[PDB]
Design a protein around this ligand. Sequence first.
Ligand SMILES: [Mg+2]
Ligand SMILES: [Mg+2]
Ligand SMILES: [Mg+2]
Ligand SMILES: [Mg+2]
Ligand SMILES: [Mg+2]
Ligand SMILES: [Mg+2]
Ligand SMILES: [Mg+2]
Ligand SMILES: [Mg+2]
Ligand SMILES: [Mg+2]
Ligand SMILES: [Mg+2]
Ligand SMILES: [Mg+2]
Lengths: 50, 75, 137, 177, 114
Amino acid sequence: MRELIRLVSSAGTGHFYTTDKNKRTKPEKIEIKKYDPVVRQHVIYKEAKI
Amino acid sequence: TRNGRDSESKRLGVKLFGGQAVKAGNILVRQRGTKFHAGYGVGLGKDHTLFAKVDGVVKFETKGAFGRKYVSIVA
Amino acid sequence: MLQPKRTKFRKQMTGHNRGLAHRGSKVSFGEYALKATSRGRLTARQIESARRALTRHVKRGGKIWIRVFPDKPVTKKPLEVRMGKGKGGVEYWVAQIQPGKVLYEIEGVSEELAREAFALAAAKLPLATSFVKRTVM
Amino acid sequence: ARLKEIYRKEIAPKLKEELQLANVMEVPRVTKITLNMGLGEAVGDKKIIENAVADLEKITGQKPVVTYARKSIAGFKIREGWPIGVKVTLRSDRMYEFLDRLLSISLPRVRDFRGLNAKSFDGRGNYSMGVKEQIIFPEIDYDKIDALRGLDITLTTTARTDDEGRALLRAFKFPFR
Amino acid sequence: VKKETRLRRARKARLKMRELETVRLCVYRSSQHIYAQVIAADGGKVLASASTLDKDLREGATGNIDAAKKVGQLVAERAKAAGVTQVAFDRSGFKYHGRVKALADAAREGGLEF
RNA sequence: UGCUUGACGAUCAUAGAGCGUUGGAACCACCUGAUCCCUUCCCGAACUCAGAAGUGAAACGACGCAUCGCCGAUGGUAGUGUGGGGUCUCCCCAUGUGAGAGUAGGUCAUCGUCAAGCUC
RNA sequence: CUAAAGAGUAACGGAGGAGUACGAAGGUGCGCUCAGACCGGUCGGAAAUCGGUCGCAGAGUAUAAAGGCAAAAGCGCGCUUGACUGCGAGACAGACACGUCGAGCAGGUACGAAAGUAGGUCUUAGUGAUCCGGUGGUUCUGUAUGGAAGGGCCAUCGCUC
Ligand SMILES: [Mg+2]
Ligand SMILES: [Mg+2]
Ligand SMILES: [Mg+2]
Ligand SMILES: [Mg+2]
Ligand SMILES: [Mg+2]
Ligand SMILES: [Mg+2]
Ligand SMILES: [Mg+2]
Ligand SMILES: [Mg+2]
Ligand SMILES: [Mg+2]
Ligand SMILES: [Mg+2]
Ligand SMILES: [Mg+2]
């Protein structure tokens, strides 16, 4: 199945996005730019276990 | 093996007919595909909902090289 | 026994029989025909019985067309079975007949012989029939 | 090229007054030769696929592109998207240089040269021929050959009817029957 | 033919200039010339035009990048006079490169906002 | 004054297709070459660039022709709202409405803006 | 489909599917057009790859059907994260609870030369209220006071309930 993951902001904020992910086909961690409303800037988010 | 299932009715179809006054944002057609196409002043939703972008009166028209039925908003 | 030999759907709604048969009411192909004057159903068993009665009488010479095909499946509930619990299962096949439909056609035989063979076939059929000769327009 | 100017200065004036054509550019002309190799046995091993690039490139001087199956067939052990062939297209003076090398240098060195089929025409002026084996082309090295493989040649011409195709092909001194 | 594959390559942008009611700077490119029309939003009326068929451009080179610069600068002068400032550049299926880009770049420096 | 060519539209087959004839002054296309910009999962095929030796062959445009396609009445027929009736699985009458198919026939479009050339 | 050309509409009526998938199969810019047939061509054959003509969507669209699809909504490639945060005029749908569409504004982006496009996927299934507990934030509260605990608020996790 597609297990849930947590995209955690690289900034000092505790903001996080949540999404799913196929953890067998692509086991590498997700690194993606998303908007952080706390610092109001587009910032790289890193996957963390929910 | 047997039957007895069905899905809920989707309440699709034309909501505002030709010559009806429309405000911006009014939903004009609910459809599965594009049975009607968006003419002037008419937007297209994710689910191919035809909605009003301007105020006016609905005009239905068939035109073009493909025989598409168009929904337009005229003054 | 005539049957569609495959279908998209096993079971059909009963429907109705309301036309006047503006198509299939002309004698194509042959020169004499049995034309239905009343309305009803023709099962495959009836069509075959009329075919055999008609063909046995025009022995040794003739060409015969069957212009009725039983493509409508008819279901039946078995005995000792209550209402409900499903439709029921196909038992036989019928052709819907409106007044005017041409059922059988023959050629290569005399008109007197054709009338004799059509009377034999029409006694197997549950409809009012009539004898018609091919017409110009 | 070595043959391009021959066609441009002597073959073309020969054909226009031979086919009875009222226009200069109506003369049949070879547009391209493309070299295909149907790469079988690739259902289990891929070592041959870049071997095919090695021999096909050397006899043409152009890097081939590996083709892929347009469908998935049960009869063969292939599915949509596997590499099952290579191909090269020639249109420039490289097109003419290969033509003379194949015609005069390569074609004579074959096992049994009974000529070339003259009826091998699609019906629209394009000539297609197939080479049974390899090593006919001098460019390769017999010792440095992994396996012995064939390939086919397609003379795509602008000829309307195949009789014009053979007329232009014979103008190249093509060995026919 | 390759003209059919070009017109259908230009359909999307042209259909997008309509439904936006924007004035279109249409461009035509030939082996011998290069053209530029300023067409109204409806598409049925031309507001300004400039080509290498003009008296000052017929003589000399016409099918190179240099002639594109003169035509693009010229259509900018006529468009401003006609009362047009905000346009959308239609490349008409031609790749935005070389002559077509040179014509548009001249109109950018000529006082046409696009 | 009108015509021809090109670009963009209106309209979307009565407009299309097929067949045949014709146009190179200009326009356009084919065309020449590829160093330069740029391009090919290979290839100047396409895209792109610099040109004008060659040609209207291909394409395109124009003109003609009902072979196909498309359009298509009048009349009738089917269905049908309302009221009524019968022999009532289905029909009929009064009144309103009225196809589809088919038939006679029609069609080788019509219009607008701009630019260049020519004509008058 | 029944369903009676707006919507809706029952039966232990007639038929099929779902309890997912995808960081690309999303966004954008650029470019392309299938299936099938016939002819020619080494192995190669009905059918593999190649060339030509016809073909004009009879293919494809992750998946069932239906409705769509040329600005293709189908296919390829480069760059990417708009599968953004706050919202939201106005509607559709509707007993309620839920649900659907969404122009536009602000913040911050991606692609494009630019006009622009992008708030997921051609659309319509892929789902489960409250309570309780857990985790990350928080300018709120803090049983004398300062803290803390605990509580609230925002985000999110745990039901083939
Ligand atoms: Mg060229
Ligand atoms: Mg010609
Ligand atoms: Mg008709
Ligand atoms: Mg009629
Ligand atoms: Mg309804
Ligand atoms: Mg109704
Ligand atoms: Mg073959
Ligand atoms: Mg075959
Ligand atoms: Mg898709
Ligand atoms: Mg305290
Ligand atoms: Mg707390």
